[PDB]
Ligand binder design. Structure first.
Ligand SMILES: CC(C)(Sc1ccncc1-c1ccc(C#N)c2ccccc12)C(=O)O
Ligand SMILES: *[C@@H]1O[C@H](CO)[C@@H](O)[C@H](O)[C@H]1NC(C)=O
Length: 515
């Protein structure tokens, strides 16, 4: 097949333009995925109390601190209890002579009158709008997990649909669905509707990712292919910084969601100018349309070759693809081969570790540090050089030590956040940034490495297994946080042990550098 690109030009003006456009689309995609850090931030909260909140009631010489103590008992975090209040005002607690032994838990009640939230940092968030707190605290990670599960469903759907309807058309309708579902998610009235709309948005996102990957690889020459995939991965690194920049200015989750959704309308517009997959069309036996697209691309590259192509070379040079694609090969076939089974196990577990760790950590930054805006921007800042160095090291030390070191370093960096004492926020934030950068480098390493571990026929199906495993682990990511009720060390230790274990497994993979 390559000869057609070598004729039309495999890395010309057209490829540069298309790469820039799809990288921009991925930037906005990353903003969409990161948003739940800022759209669902948990502001500090307490029960509503008659003395504290009824501004028309009798004011007194007592300051707000003393009244707060008179109204609400202390919680485990050496801070006001976040879910219950005193049944009757504890005037006896005004004195320093008082002791907490004076009040029974029977003297306390849950927030019958609802909650009061801090508005200083975020003006409005999902948590404060639909009271996803206390008894309902499980629902926030539930929302994140549902969003991530929509991606698994979307991939399983968009595979067949993309083959039936073509890459560009599915990408276009995916952009449109992202726009419509996202703007609806901003205005939605009630939490079930928000869950539904986030799920459909995930259904769109899966298609965007898969079809972008397919479209870039088809039009890119073989030797430049890893670099193009690396740029597609750097799009997310820039997306982190974009999320920080947007969230700093916009503090209202309705407006934030609306702002990050609208740009996808523009992608719907300019995706109409991009060309359809040539290989898909030729497989569909339509050489006239494929040749129209090809000579259009050649015109963009300014070549003379528009006068030289014929349908016979177009069809014949793809005859091998047409013949080989007929075979009934899927995941079950991959598991049969004696020499491939161990490779499959370890590769799948590496994808699983990536999804698990990244979507566990990157969506609750509020727990890893002290200022989530700067933490987001620094995740971007560290991810960029981490991925570029990952490429520059992967091409020299071999896939095996590069991937193994990436995963092991990421896991050990995250584990360090358990051991460093809670109050040292600066060092903890730095370690968290480094760990997430390590996971990004591991993503690049595994993307390139998995493509080489398998024979050319099974390559794409094995990559499919890997991606599905990554999404499966991402779904479990958020649920791990529910264990945090028993303490913060347990969720973070679970997040840290898995990537280290998979890294020690990655060390056993066969090398594939051209040694
Ligand atoms: C889960 C994956 C494998 S990826 C994905 C899906 C949804 N949200 C974000 C990402 C994502 C996470 C880390 C990356 C890194 N480094 C990255 C790079 C490029 C594109 C997406 C990601 C998929 O379903 O395809
Ligand atoms: C607030 O205090 C005023 C004081 O006159 C009272 O009339 C009113 O019922 C109170 N409302 C609430 C909700 O506490």
């Amino acid at each position: 097949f390559s000869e057609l690109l070598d004729l039309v030009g495999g890395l010309g003006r057209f490829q540069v333009l298309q790469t820039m456009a799809l990288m921009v689309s991925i930037m906005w995609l990353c903003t969409q995925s990161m948003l739940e850090n800022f759209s669902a931030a948990v502001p500090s909260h307490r029960c509503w109390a008659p003395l504290l909140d009824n501004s028309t009631a009798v004011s007194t010489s007592l300051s707000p601190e003393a009244l707060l103590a008179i109204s609400i008992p202390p919680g485990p975090n050496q801070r006001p209890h976040q879910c219950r209040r005193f049944r009757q005002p504890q005037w006896q607690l005004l004195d320093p002579n008082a002791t907490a032994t004076s009040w029974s838990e029977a003297d306390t009640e849950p927030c019958v009158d609802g909650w009061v939230y801090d508005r200083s940092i975020f003006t409005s968030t999902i948590v404060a709008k639909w009271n996803l707190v206390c008894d309902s605290h499980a629902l926030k990670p539930m929302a994140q997990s549902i969003y991530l599960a929509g991606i698994l469903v979307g991939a399983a759907a968009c595979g067949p649909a993309s083959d039936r309807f073509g890459r560009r058309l599915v990408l276009t309708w995916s952009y449109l669905q992202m726009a419509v579902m996202g703007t609806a998610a901003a205005f939605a009235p009630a939490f079930p509707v928000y869950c539904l709309f986030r799920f459909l948005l995930a259904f769109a996102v899966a298609g965007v990712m898969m079809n972008t990957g397919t479209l870039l690889m088809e039009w890119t020459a073989a030797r430049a292919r890893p670099l193009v995939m690396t740029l597609n991965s750097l799009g997310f690194s820039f997306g982190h910084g974009l999320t920080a920049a947007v969230a700093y200015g916009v503090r209202d989750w309705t407006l934030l969601q609306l702002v990050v959704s609208v740009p996808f309308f523009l992608c719907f517009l300019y995706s109409w100018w991009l060309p359809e997959s040539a290989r898909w069309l030729i497989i569909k036996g339509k050489p006239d349309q494929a040749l129209q697209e090809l000579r259009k691309v050649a015109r963009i590259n300014g070549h003379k070759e528009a006068k030289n192509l014929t349908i016979e070379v177009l069809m014949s040079s793809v005859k091998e693809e047409v013949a080989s694609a007929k075979e009934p090969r899927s995941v079950l076939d991959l598991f049969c081969v004696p020499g491939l089974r161990f490779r499959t196990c370890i590769s799948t577990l590496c994808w699983f570790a990536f999804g698990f760790t990244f979507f566990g950590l990157a969506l609750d930054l509020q727990a890893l540090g002290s200022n989530i805006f700067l933490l987001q921007m620094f995740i971007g800042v560290v991810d960029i050089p981490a991925k570029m160095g990952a490429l520059l090291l992967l091409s020299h030390l071999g896939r095996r030590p590069t991937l193994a070191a990436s995963l092991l370093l990421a896991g050990l960096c995250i584990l360090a956040n358990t051991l460093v004492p809670h109050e040292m926020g600066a060092l903890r934030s730095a370690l968290a940034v480094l760990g997430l950068g390590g996971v990004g480098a591991a993503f690049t390493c595994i993307t390139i490495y998995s493509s080489e571990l398998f024979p050319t026929v099974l390559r794409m199906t094995a990559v499919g297994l890997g991606q599905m495993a990554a999404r499966g682990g991402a779904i479990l990511g958020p649920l791990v946080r529910l264990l945090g009720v028993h303490g913060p060390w347990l969720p973070l230790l679970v997040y840290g042990t898995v990537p280290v274990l998979s890294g020690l497994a990655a060390l056993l993979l066969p090398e594939t550098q051209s040694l």
